[PDB]
Write a protein that binds this DNA or RNA. Sequence first.
DNA 1: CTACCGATAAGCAGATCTCTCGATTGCGTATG
DNA 2: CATACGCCTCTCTGCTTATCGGTAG
RNA 3: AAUCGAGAG
Lengths: 1462, 107
Amino acid sequence: MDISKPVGSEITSVDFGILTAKEIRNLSAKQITNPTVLDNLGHPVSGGLYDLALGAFLRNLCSTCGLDEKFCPGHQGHIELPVPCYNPLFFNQLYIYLRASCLFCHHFRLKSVEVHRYACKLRLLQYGLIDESYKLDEITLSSTLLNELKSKRSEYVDMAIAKALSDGRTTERGSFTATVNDERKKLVHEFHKKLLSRGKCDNCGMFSPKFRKDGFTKIFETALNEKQITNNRVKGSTYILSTEVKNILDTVFRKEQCVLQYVFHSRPNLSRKLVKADSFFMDVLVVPPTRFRLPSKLGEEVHENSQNQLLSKVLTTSLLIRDLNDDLSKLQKDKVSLEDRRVIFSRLMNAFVTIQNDVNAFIDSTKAQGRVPIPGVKQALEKKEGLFRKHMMGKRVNYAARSVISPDPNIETNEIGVPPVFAVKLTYPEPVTAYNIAELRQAVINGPDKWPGATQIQNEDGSLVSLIGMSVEQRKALANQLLTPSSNVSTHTLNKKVYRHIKNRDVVLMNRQPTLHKASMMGHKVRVLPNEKTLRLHYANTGAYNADFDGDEMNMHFPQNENARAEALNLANTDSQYLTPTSGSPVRGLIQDHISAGVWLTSKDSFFTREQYQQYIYGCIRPEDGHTTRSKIVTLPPTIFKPYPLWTGKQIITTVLLNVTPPDMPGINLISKNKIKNEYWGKGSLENEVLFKDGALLCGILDKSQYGASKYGIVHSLHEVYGPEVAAKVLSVLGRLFTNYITATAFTCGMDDLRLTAEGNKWRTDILKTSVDTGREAAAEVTNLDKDTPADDPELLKRLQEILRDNNKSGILDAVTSSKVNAITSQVVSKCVPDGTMKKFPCNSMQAMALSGAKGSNVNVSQIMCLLGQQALEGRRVPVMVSGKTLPSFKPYETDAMAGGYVKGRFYSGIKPQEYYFHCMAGREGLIDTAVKTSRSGYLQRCLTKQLEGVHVSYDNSIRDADGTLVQFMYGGDAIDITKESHMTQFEFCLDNYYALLKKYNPSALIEHLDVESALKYSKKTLKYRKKHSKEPHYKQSVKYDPVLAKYNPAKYLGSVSENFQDKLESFLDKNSKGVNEKKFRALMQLKYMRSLINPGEAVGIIASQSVGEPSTQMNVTLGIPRLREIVMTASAAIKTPQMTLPIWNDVSDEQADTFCKSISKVLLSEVIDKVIVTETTGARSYVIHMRFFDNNEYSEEYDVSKEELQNVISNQFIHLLEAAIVKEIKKQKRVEANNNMNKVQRDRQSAIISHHRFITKYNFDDESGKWCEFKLELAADTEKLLMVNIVEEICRKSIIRQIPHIDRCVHPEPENGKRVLVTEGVNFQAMWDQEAFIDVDGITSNDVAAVLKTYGVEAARNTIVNEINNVFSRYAISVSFRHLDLIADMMTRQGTYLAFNRQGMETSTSSFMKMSYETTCQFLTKAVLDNEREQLDSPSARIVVGKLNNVGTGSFDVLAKVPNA
Amino acid sequence: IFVYQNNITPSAMKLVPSIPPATIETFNEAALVVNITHHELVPKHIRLSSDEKRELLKRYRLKESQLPRIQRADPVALYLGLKRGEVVKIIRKSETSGRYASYRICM
DNA sequence: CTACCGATAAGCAGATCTCTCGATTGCGTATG
DNA sequence: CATACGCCTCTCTGCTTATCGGTAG
RNA sequence: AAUCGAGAG
Ligand SMILES: [Mg+2]
Ligand SMILES: [Zn+2]
Ligand SMILES: [Zn+2]
């Protein structure tokens, strides 16, 4: 865009609609007559598809506009097709309305009273009245009664709307929100369902014929019934033409115009236009201009446009039917060849089918029929490669470069290395002024080759001049006449613009795909280097961009307007993003070699003379480049005075800080530690802790923990005390300090760093060679066979084979053996490293960089020097071949750690080939897992961010989506900014630095324009109130006093702070240990809280979506991304693994707890059947089913099931299920000892059984031992053979003995963090609500969300959502803020139900553009055009669609200009 | 209030709305065994009156329906007898900010 | 008795970052 | 034998739809 | 311009 040609007008909204058939005829510049697109001689043909009336075409002056190809914008035309064609978009609506319509009386086949009820409800919902629409159903209490009902309902609705308009609950345009949209869509859906359910028409009593369809462009009806015709006669698969359906619909729509105006208008219809049913039928097509249908020359081949192809096909069928009508009139006079007339009439019918299907193909490619298929209009904007996503959300851009990145530790951390080739190509139009002609004339003189220089000069009249092909003297004349008065009156307020080259003054945008989070796209001040053609990047930004230098490249966008320059320089520049809003932890800092050099320069053993010290300091600082603050470098006293002046490295760090840190400000009194244990430095060492003071380092060493990916470091505290700018300059200065240092005392690694000693190797060998017995004992224990048994035992081999066949047994064995060999590995590592290495820290450079966190880890060092260790395939050791061998070399079913994937080698002395194979397997598995995990989180993050992309903090500190609906009133309940909450609870550091923190939290400069009394007074009042109420259950406590921020503005009223903050502040003020007094400390902490609030308009929804998606890249109850997407992406009530946590009473025993668990847990019938025997006897077809039961003394005390209960189960559930199965299978088929008489009561039970069941003949269940139960069974002779085994087994498995519904087990987990818990395999709160003798029913918290929502409330559901979403992040310790998760939960419970983040969960949103860009663009387009929804242009996606400045952030306000004169 | 066990007569369920502004609520014993508001997972819901509700609306410059919604079938609305339009007030024991007060309208 | 409806397992519609190269593009038959 | 013109088979969610009976007119 | 193939982070 140009900045000197502003646009007066601007779009303010957009409303969909149906293009009326006559406006196009009025609009159209030309009809489309003949299919032949072009003739020979390279010329257009009149009435074709390339008419000059439809736009300019290849130096043919447009016959409509008269301009040439560079100025003709195109001109739409129309093709008139004779037979109206169904509009394929609205086929389902056409079917819905045509169906459930009575062509007899021309009304809906539904009571007019109910139809008017729905119409009144909808006209009420149009104004947002939700409760009125429900109290309208209170008037129900025949023609006179029905008309009274109509009159009273309409009068009531008119009064309701009048009251709403008078009060102010609506305006003339209507009140439409997400809740109103949900109610309206719910009501319309129920109305359509009720309409398409009735039988004969209830307003007249007459039946109407049904309709059918074979898909799209396929319309048919049916015939009546033999009884229906009799009903019709006393009351008083045929094809249907498109014009016939249109004629049917016209009448009924004219009749139901009221209901149809209240259905087809989600907004109150101000235009009071009718609802004409011809909108569903396209009588006339529109042809896009030649501009949009042009062809292109791919060399000599020229491709005809596919739109032209489909339109010419439609026109071919149109000319076919038209010229067929000419000969249909030939048989009109000669009505004697009617048979051939019927033949060509069937031909006309098939041509109608063909033309309707041709238009269907032209719109939707899939709605055509026939099996390369040409894209249709719907397919042109539907999906990822469609139009919305590929050309409106993200577009290719000008003034943007790209190249491979390389490191450069000699640029400031807010800079980037711009190659000369870009610097002579990327440009920036600088409008010449009297403060630029010194440099702009020089740029013009230098021209487009000599940087800094210029490429174009844009004249005052807006005309452009190119300097590419000019001479030095010519450009000299242009530059000397550059700025001059303009004699043209029109452009009397414009000046020349010079397209100058990119200097070092400007700022640039950098972006390393994929952009997982917002920090991966920052702004850098450009520095131009005369080196090779590659972008040069500082090392600290590698963490933010996740970028390496192994061949990486990243886009470099050049902002072209001062708005974007100031945007990237203040909100997105790399210094203003020291921490990430994911968790408020630092993301920047030096990485590996600077850290390993710090462990050496800050080592106590390093001294540096006067010359070396001063050289280091000057090379690090360079006051001539602004790194200083005192206009002259300052120094320090040397540590040592005799014999000669020496310094120390810690003194070097101290003076570096003193030189960068602003003067007259106390130094950072910091106390922390690092990654280096004291015992590494030797006895009596205190280097584990660092003791900074007054800007001086005094103990410990600097490390990764004090600069890099670690918190509470020196650079973090410098950030916290002097803002992010000084921390950035400290990062830069330490980067230039540890670099020039490491040149002088270089850092290396070699084979000597990877060795051990003789004693270390001895220990390693012995503790490793215990592994033989280790593996054998693991196997022997798992198989439950006797310990210390020889491996060649046949029973051991058999048990191992069974375990191999069974997946769960194999998993158990692998887990046990893996734990044992991990124990052996841990022993080896502990005994060897660091006590065995021949070279020790700090000399051992490998161990030094492992300890220091520069690179690698203790695990890496341990498997390089000591032991590679057990290899984990998935959660198992190694796949085993069906023969039981793990490899060709290893014997089948081998008890051996080395066979089971446990490698005893180390990378130092190499790995044997078997271990090499296992390690290759594990490494490949890792690579595949990473490849999947790269793309797994993409859909999750995009789905979250499409819905949350609008929500942003209002200027009332409440967060609410761009449609206005409110999600939360405070961000997390405290309005505390995640970045700024770094040290709110670090009161010790706050006290230690009070005097430095004051210079920024100036009270006398930030007290006047504020109220400092009311908030603190109410705070003390409420604090005392809560203290006095002491401890009582939350449902008992009063709500007379609320949190202060709720009543008092947290940003205008000082002291209005959170409640946790006050409690912790008072608790740590209970120290009573030291000027600084409680009053000044309290006032400064409260001003800190006031300055630690999220600014309004912060894109909190985007930030939360990124914070919950980007950590998901690094991912028995479901865990990881599966669990995350189950919670948020799907909201599945059919949760894969549901559980409920049941606290048990403190006054119960463990044995009683197990008894109750087995009393609750489900038992199925199959659990207690050793084997069921079936004796098929045909000589009538008898079936003795004798079931063998387990030991009574065993199963009774294992399942808490008794003989009587089993008897009842068999007599009631099992036999009946089996009998139903037998009879169903036959119905589908056509298409030990005993005694002869137990007792008389037993015989009576047998008779009862025979009477109760259908084809049973015997029954007896042992009531004295519970060991058998038979029941003879027969069928007829016509039945075939039956299995009587599979059916028995499946019925047996289904039939239950003692089950609590929706519970299938109740295990007793070992208590964790106290609070004994009983957890089940299901959720049924009603069941345990009865049982209070054991379970603390007041504290049952379950895994499910829908269950807890419908049985405990929306807020318990939101608690469960936050708990579950944090729980999955909590297995990997990826701590995300408790504010993002709660924002997600309250956004997905914003309608009182458990909503997901998908297309179903975004139906009730006012922004249709959001849904259309998201997915299924067509269906959301129909739902918006049919209701005549006026897209309000306020969601960010809608703004991007139209081209309006986004309202989130720098678009949440406006800008005025106070003029000085009237 | 009319506590009903087992199952209520489906023919009898069509008369509750028909009554004049005097309401008639029914509650099943199934959810009556345990007071769900005592369960510490569920926050303590409280009603709101007309004056303070109007004060809230004027403070936030909002509409009735732009507030978050709680459903008429919500078990806690069955406890608290919420009509359509009564802005419930909920107390959020947010771990980030201790005692927090939020709202969900009933429509 | 039967219609009103309230609920019982199956068919289908739509889902599952950016970049740079190179190669090739369906056929059958009718008139001159 | 060149030149020219058209016919043709190894996922998961969430809403299309069930067969039948309960039960007041 | 699409399809297929090779790769980069
Ligand atoms: Mg890379
Ligand atoms: Zn034109
Ligand atoms: Zn009728």
